[PDB]
Amino acid sequence: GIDLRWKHVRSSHRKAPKSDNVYLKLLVKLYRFLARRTEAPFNKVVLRRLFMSRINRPPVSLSRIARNLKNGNEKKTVVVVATVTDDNRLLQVPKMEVAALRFTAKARARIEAAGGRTLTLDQLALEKPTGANTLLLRGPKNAREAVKHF
């Protein structure tokens, strides 16, 4: 016998989505290829967020995007791996290029009416395969009723 006071630890993170969405499976295959064959850390972070559950992908609003588009970020491509929602408190939407997992109808309409562009993540993979000149944004994780109750 061998004395092993320490214990080998199995992985405590997701390695695959629990979702059965076929298009998400295709996206996961594409970003597995990109994070294996490139050196860009952007692709690895994107792959990990594609694995995540919905409470780990809180929505990002247009006012949050407009806040982060200030101070030299007006030309960077915004990348969100969750839903982008509309904020009707934001009366003037700036021009922006946003790639998201999905958009709400009003958010897509307001971005296109302001003159920006909405992209899917596979179009993002085509145009920026190394994540150059991008702004990777997350929504508020702890802004949940249960997390308040913790």
């Binding site: 979702s19 059965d20 969405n21 076929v22 298009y23």
Partner: protein
């Protein structure tokens, strides 16, 4: 332009008429959503039983 689809006659031959393909045929194909809705929907005609 949008794609077209051929109209066939009663003899099985094309009539020369075409129609624009509706946009619903380009909808995403989601078997997980279809399975969830089908599992729910197939129980809606059930009659109750009890001893």
């Amino acid at each position: 332009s949008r794609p077209t689809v051929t109209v066939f006659g009663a003899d099985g031959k094309p009539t020369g008429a075409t129609e624009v393909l509706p946009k619903v045929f380009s909808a995403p194909i989601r078997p997980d959503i279809v399975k969830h809705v089908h599992t729910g929907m197939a129980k809606n005609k059930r009659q109750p039983y009890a001893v």
